[PDB]
Amino acid sequence: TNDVHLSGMSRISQAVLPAGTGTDGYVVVDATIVPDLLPRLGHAARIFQRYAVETLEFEIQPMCPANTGGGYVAGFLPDPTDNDHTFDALQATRGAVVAKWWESRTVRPQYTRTLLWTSSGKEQRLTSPGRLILLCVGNNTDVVNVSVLCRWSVRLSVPSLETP
Amino acid sequence: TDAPVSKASTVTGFGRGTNDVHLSGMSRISQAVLPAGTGTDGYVVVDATIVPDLLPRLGHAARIFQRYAVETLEFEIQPMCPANTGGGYVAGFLPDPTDNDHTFDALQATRGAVVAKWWESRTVRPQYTRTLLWTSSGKEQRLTSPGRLILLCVGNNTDVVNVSVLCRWSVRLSVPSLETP
Amino acid sequence: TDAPVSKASTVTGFGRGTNDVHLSGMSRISQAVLPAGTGTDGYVVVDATIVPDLLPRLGHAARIFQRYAVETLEFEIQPMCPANTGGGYVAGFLPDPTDNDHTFDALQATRGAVVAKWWESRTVRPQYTRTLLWTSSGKEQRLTSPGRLILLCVGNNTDVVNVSVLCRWSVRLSVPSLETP
Amino acid sequence: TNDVHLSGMSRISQAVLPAGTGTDGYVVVDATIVPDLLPRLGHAARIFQRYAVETLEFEIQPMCPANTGGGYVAGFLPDPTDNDHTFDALQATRGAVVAKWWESRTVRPQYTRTLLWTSSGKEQRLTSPGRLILLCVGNNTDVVNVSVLCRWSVRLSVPSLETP
Amino acid sequence: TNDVHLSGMSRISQAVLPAGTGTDGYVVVDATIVPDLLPRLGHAARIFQRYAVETLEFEIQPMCPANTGGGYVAGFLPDPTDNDHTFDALQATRGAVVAKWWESRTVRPQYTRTLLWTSSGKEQRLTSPGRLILLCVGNNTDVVNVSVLCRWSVRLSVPSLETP
Amino acid sequence: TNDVHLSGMSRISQAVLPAGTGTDGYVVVDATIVPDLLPRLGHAARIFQRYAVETLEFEIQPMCPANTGGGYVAGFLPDPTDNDHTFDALQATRGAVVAKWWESRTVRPQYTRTLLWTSSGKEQRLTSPGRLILLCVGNNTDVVNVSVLCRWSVRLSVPSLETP
Ligand SMILES: [Ca+2]
Ligand SMILES: [Ca+2]
Ligand SMILES: [Ca+2]
Ligand SMILES: [Ca+2]
Ligand SMILES: [Ca+2]
Ligand SMILES: [Ca+2]
């Protein structure tokens, strides 16, 4: 077997949220999980054709004063083609969390473990396991710098160099 | 205890909804009427793509689940006409949702296809994929539907024919969500 | 066999659909924002009648069932605001769906009512009818809903308050049908 | 072994019989069983040189009103070179059936199991196992659309592309 | 069972490269491997619904004089969607070969034995195992009649009948 | 484990040698084997800190007419620092080959499987396994398009991320 197991921590997305703009339902983070976003996996997927996600956890680590107001809801939609970004969709899914802006939380979602494709294509269900969505729950009193780390572990295969 | 700057949140049972439900039923996927003389050979009577939306009770249950897998799928062709009607029918289930071929040979090639007279009711026990399929629509139909059902006329019928295609199904829904088409 | 005048029908599995499904979840029945100063005493923050339509995932499952019975029903009041907000709230669940009284006494009288500060989250474990209730709407609300939830302010709040009322429910649907509102 | 076992249902021949033309001995169906007639086996024999029939049943499925008059006799002559189409030849053979026009019957004949040739040739005994013959027994009062399905099962060999 | 193992060789593409036009990077051959491309598999796929490529190899057999100064690079990209006509992209793929214009070579690539579909659809990744690309390396001196052959061994399934 | 075995072929260098310039001792190719030189290993080393070359071979594939009178000598010096462009120095190294300009050959050298560093530094002996040298033997007659390929199999370690 020529499968290469690669794993590690990496920050998929960082967002800045100025004070007073975090209204309810505001989409702070909306990231379709593909290996291109992941820093270390971006180079590994550039040299392979297919990958299979073996572990995926999203650690939301926001950095705001403890007296800041408002909260956030984070979830992982297993369907990359789904284009719904609301509290209802997040609360429906498994692994979703809701917490105050100064709390760091962990999202352990339900993701497909089949063999996906690193490259882009017409069918998004064949390239990504899902979409991470992080929304505001209430108005934030202070500016929030939110960073979403992602502990991943994939199994690459089929060596081939690829272009952006 | 003390009075902190901000107390920790205590939302406990979030993202722990029900994950798997088994749903069963038997619904009419098609109903057709043929006035005398239109049942020419090869005329397509029923062309129904098996999707959760086609099944009414499953249509709502598929709106709260991401992926479903078909466990049981059997079709019934019930022609409600007397035993003095000429001509006949051929019914089949193409496992490929994208296969749009409407001929006698294409139907007869599939496993479980039936050929009968217009006064004989039949049951199609087809070949379908047990793999998990996506409830919501996508770019490729082969990831969302187990197949297609085709019902054709074989001979020129003599009288008006009423034909009902029923489908006994049983699916297993997984990966909870809330689809908003 | 012989050739009769008309052959007998052979529809076998008709009217034998699934009868009972247990459905569970936890959904936000209400969400309110109070700018500073509007939290006057007795001001009604949340007034939600517990019906299957109010619960999103149950709304679709109730459209294919006639009667449902509530097995578990517990509400959570989550105020997402700091620990320096004045005033407080009272939350209760009136078992009578038609009881439209919004006062502190009416809420506190009910079993399981909670009184807390705006920086304390609470859980209401109320008294609800275990009897079978009709999914579809009718002339009398007491045959279709287990009760009503009321959340009121107790004191004048100092800061803007975000309050979310979540409801952990568990129902048993019976008597299959297809409701078309 | 590179033998490919292929089997399936397929309609060899459909015939329309107008009312009043089905006199006694009329040859409704006269089909020399070669893989070209069989729809799915037509494509399989186009890519192979030799085949051996392992199972052969002919299901006659006529579609006429139940009050129609007259009957049909169906048989399978094991000799493709034989050019006799009468009730005598059919009744002599094994597996022959006789039935009213509205009855569907099954013919389980006696066929050679040797290795035949898909392509045509001078000797017809080396290419086909036999000839299906379906005749009218009496005058038919109504128009009859008769279809002869064939449950077959062959064992192909010797890969080679072929032309009509 | 419905599984029918088939194998054989077939010329997927043939190209004629006149003298002087074989500049570096020129795309001599770009052929997406589909069942219709292979003659014997073209008929096999017309009578089945699914196929899985168990074995796949290619042979480049250029037919040029021994005084033809030039070279070619050949490789099987295991992703039908990927489109990159560069030397490094081909050489990255496993089994890719580089040779002179008067030397026949064999490509033994890597690919996933996933159960593909014999009929075309919106997504090419479900109907094709990949695509063979043959490029020029250096300017050729004489006319080259290149003929890429493919030795395949596939496993058909789900009996049906189709029209292209 | 952090160890990730990778392997593949990549063209380390390509040179064009015009007619008459291939005098004896001329240095056609002098390429220091570094991870950046190999495309697929270039991305693999950008996401790791250490690598050890488990297997390393080279193939010389000159592309010249069969009437090209001349010869080449190829060899892998296992010391990056050593700098000697002489025939005897190359032939001394294990696996060195001598051939005609129209004959592809394979170099299977000797080297130490020491855990090298993927990023450049002051000492080249810690970042490169060696250097391949290809010299002329005798004056060539026609233009030669030489392309040295390298088949490598390395073992990465110490996960990290780097920029070149
Ligand atoms: Ca790709
Ligand atoms: Ca969906
Ligand atoms: Ca009702
Ligand atoms: Ca032949
Ligand atoms: Ca198809
Ligand atoms: Ca470094």
> DSSP labels for D39-97?
HHHHHHHTTEEEE-EEEEEEEEEEE--TT---EEEEEEES-TT----SHHHHHHSSS-E
Compute, in angstroms, the gap from residue C2 CA to the centroid of ligand 3.
46
Phi, psi of E143 (to 5 degrees): -70, 135
Could you tell me the CA-to-CA distances from B123 to B28, B116, B160, E89 in Å, in that order?
A: 14, 10, 22, 53
Nearest to B21 by CA among B178, B179, B180, B170: B170
DSSP state at residue E63:
B
Cβ(B96)–Cβ(B82) below 8 Å: no
Compute, in angstroms, the gap from residue D162 CA to the centroid of ligand 5.
23
Give the pairing of strands C114-117 and B147-153.
unpaired
| Inter-chain residue contact D4 with E6, CB threshold 8 Å | yes
Q: How far apart are the first and last CA of chain B?
A: 49
- Report residue B8 as tokens: 């920790």
What letter represents residue B162's amino acid? N
| Inter-chain residue contact D39 with B109, CB threshold 8 Å | yes
Task: Identify the bridge partners of residue B90 per DSSP, sorted by sequence position.
Answer: B115, B152
Q: How far apart are the first and last CA of chain D?
A: 27
Q: How far apart are the first and last CA of chain C?
A: 49
**Gaps in chain A after residue (C–N beyond 2.5 Å):** none
d(CA F88, CA F79): 16
Could you tell me the CA-to-CA distances from B176 to A30, B67, B102, C57 in Å, in that order?
A: 20, 8, 37, 10
| Inter-chain residue contact F61 with E91, CB threshold 8 Å | no
* CB pairs < 8 Å spanning C and D: 3
Comparing CB atoms, the residue among A115, A121, A157 nearest residue E81 is A121
The technique is cryo-EM
With 0-12 CB in 10 A as exposed, 13-18 as middle and 19+ as buried, what is C38? middle
Could you tell me the CA-to-CA distances from C116 to B113, C126, C157, D61 in Å, in that order?
A: 68, 16, 13, 80
Q: Catalogue the E-assigned strands of chain F.
A: 4-17, 27-32, 48-60, 71-77, 97-100, 105-107, 116-117, 131-137, 144-159
d(CA F125, CA F113): 12
Closest-CA residue of chain A to C58: A92
Sheet holding C114-117, edge to edge: C44-50, C147-153, C88-94, C114-117
Cβ(E157)–Cβ(E52) below 8 Å: yes
User: How many other C-beta atoms are found inside a 10 Å radius of the C-beta of residue B132?
Assistant: 18
Cβ(B97)–Cβ(B142) below 8 Å: yes
Comparing CB atoms, the residue among B13, B26, B56 nearest residue C178 is B56
Comparing CB atoms, the residue among B110, B141, B142 nearest residue E160 is B110
Tracing tokens 């907000």 back to the chain, one arrives at: C85
| Inter-chain residue contact C25 with B17, CB threshold 8 Å | yes
Q: Catalogue the E-assigned strands of chain B.
A: 21-34, 44-50, 65-79, 88-94, 114-117, 122-124, 132-134, 147-153, 161-176
Q: Mutating which of A36, A40, A43 best tests the F interface, going by the most F Cβ atoms within 10 A?
A: A43
Where helices occur in chain E by DSSP H, the ranges are 39-45, 87-92
Tracing tokens 């700057």 back to the chain, one arrives at: B5
Cβ(D101)–Cβ(D72) below 8 Å: yes
DSSP state at residue E126:
G
Q: Which residues contact residue F72 at a Cβ distance below 8 angstroms, ignoring those fewer than 6 apart?
A: F28, F60, F62, F98, F99, F100, F101, F134, F135, F136, F137, F146
- Which residues of chain C have a CB within 8 Å of the CB of B25? 17-18
Do D and F touch, 3+ Cβ pairs within 8 Å? The answer is no
- Report residue F69 as tokens: 């009178």
- Which residues of chain C have a CB within 8 Å of the CB of A88? 27, 56
With 0-12 CB in 10 A as exposed, 13-18 as middle and 19+ as buried, what is F100? middle
Known binding-site positions of E for Ca(2+): 49, 79, 82, 119, 162
With 0-12 CB in 10 A as exposed, 13-18 as middle and 19+ as buried, what is F27? exposed
- Report residue C143 as tokens: 């045959």
Tracing tokens 């040029």 back to the chain, one arrives at: E64
DSSP state at residue E78:
S
Chains near B (3 or more Cβ pairs under 8 Å): A, C, D, E
d(CA C29, CA C149): 9
Q: Mutating which of E160, E162, E163 best tests the B interface, going by the most B Cβ atoms within 10 A?
A: E160
Could you tell me the CA-to-CA distances from B43 to A69, B87, E17, F131 in Å, in that order?
A: 67, 12, 51, 74
What letter represents residue D104's amino acid? S
DSSP state at residue A19:
T
Question: Alpha-carbon torsion A43, A47, A50, A54, what sign?
Answer: negative
Compute, in angstroms, the gap from residue E155 CA to the centroid of ligand 1.
24
Where helices occur in chain B by DSSP H, the ranges are 56-61, 104-109
Cβ(B85)–Cβ(B158) below 8 Å: yes
How far does the CA of residue D143 sit from the closest CA of chain C (Å)? Answer: 18
- For the CA atoms of C2, C3, C6, C10, the dihedral, rounded to the nearest 10 degrees, stands at 60
Resolution (A): 3.2
Cβ(D154)–Cβ(D53) below 8 Å: yes
Chains near C (3 or more Cβ pairs under 8 Å): A, B, D
Compute, in angstroms, the gap from residue B180 CA to the centroid of ligand 2.
9
d(CA E27, CA E31): 11
Cβ(D124)–Cβ(D117) below 8 Å: no
The C-alpha angle B132, B137, B142, rounded to 5 degrees, equals 50
Q: How far apart are the first and last CA of chain E?
A: 25
Annotated ligand binding at C41? The verdict is no
| Inter-chain residue contact D44 with E39, CB threshold 8 Å | no
Q: How many CA atoms lie within 13 A of D2 on its CB side?
A: 12
With 0-12 CB in 10 A as exposed, 13-18 as middle and 19+ as buried, what is E1? exposed
Nearest to E26 by CA among E155, E144, E160, E112: E144
What letter represents residue C85's amino acid? T
- Which residues of chain C have a CB within 8 Å of the CB of A100? 80
d(CA D90, CA F88): 92
Q: What's chain D's length in residues?
A: 164
| Inter-chain residue contact D63 with B158, CB threshold 8 Å | no
Phi, psi of E69 (to 5 degrees): -85, 115
d(CA B161, CA B38): 10
d(CA F124, CA F57): 20
- Report residue A22 as tokens: 């975090």
Compute, in angstroms, the gap from residue F107 CA to the centroid of ligand 5.
49
Chains near D (3 or more Cβ pairs under 8 Å): B, C, E
Interior/surface letters C98-122, b for 16+ CB within 10 angstroms, e for the rest: eeeebebebbeebeebbbebbbebb
- Which residues of chain C have a CB within 8 Å of the CB of B78? 9-11
Nearest to D59 by CA among E60, C11, E159, B117: B117
- Report residue E68 as tokens: 């033809």
- Report residue A119 as tokens: 């490259």
d(CA A110, CA A116): 16
Q: How far apart are the first and last CA of chain F?
A: 25
d(CA C20, CA C179): 16
Q: Which residues contact residue D1 at a Cβ distance below 8 angstroms, ignoring those fewer than 6 apart?
A: none
Cβ(B6)–Cβ(C82) below 8 Å: yes
Tracing tokens 């299979």 back to the chain, one arrives at: A52
Which helix (H) or strand (E) segment holds residue E129: the answer is: none
- For the CA atoms of B113, B116, B118, B121, the dihedral, rounded to the nearest 10 degrees, stands at -70
Cβ(C61)–Cβ(C130) below 8 Å: no
| Inter-chain residue contact A70 with C80, CB threshold 8 Å | yes
How far does the CA of residue D66 sit from the closest CA of chain C (Å)? Answer: 6
- Report residue E51 as tokens: 């196929």
Tracing tokens 């493709």 back to the chain, one arrives at: D80
d(CA E60, CA E137): 14
d(CA C8, CA D74): 29
Comparing CB atoms, the residue among C10, C18, C56 nearest residue B25 is C18
- Report residue C124 as tokens: 């209401």
Annotated ligand binding at D160? The verdict is no
Cβ(B110)–Cβ(B95) below 8 Å: yes
Cβ(C29)–Cβ(C145) below 8 Å: no
d(CA C147, CA C141): 9
- For the CA atoms of C166, C168, C173, C179, the dihedral, rounded to the nearest 10 degrees, stands at 10
Task: Identify the bridge partners of residue A150 per DSSP, sorted by sequence position.
Answer: A10, A58
Cβ(E158)–Cβ(E115) below 8 Å: no
- Which residues of chain C have a CB within 8 Å of the CB of D102? 3
- Secondary structure of chain C in HEC code, one letter for each residue: CCCCCCCCCCCCCCCCCCCCEEEEEEEEEEEEEECCCCCCCCCEEEEEEECCCCCHHHHHHHHHEEEEEEEEEEEEEEECCCCCCCCEEEEEEECCCCCCCCCHHHHHHCCCCEEEECCCCEEECCCCCCCEEECCCCCCHHHCCCEEEEEEECCCCCCCEEEEEEEEEEEEEEEECCCCC
Annotated ligand binding at B105? The verdict is no
Which helix (H) or strand (E) segment holds residue A89: the answer is: helix A87-92
Backbone Cα Rg of chain B: 22
d(CA B115, CA D72): 19
Where helices occur in chain F by DSSP H, the ranges are 39-45, 87-92
- Report residue F93 as tokens: 């190294």
Comparing CB atoms, the residue among F5, F39, F47 nearest residue A161 is F39
Nearest to D107 by CA among D91, D88, D118: D91
Nearest to C39 by CA among C85, C99, C80: C85
d(CA D35, CA D29): 17
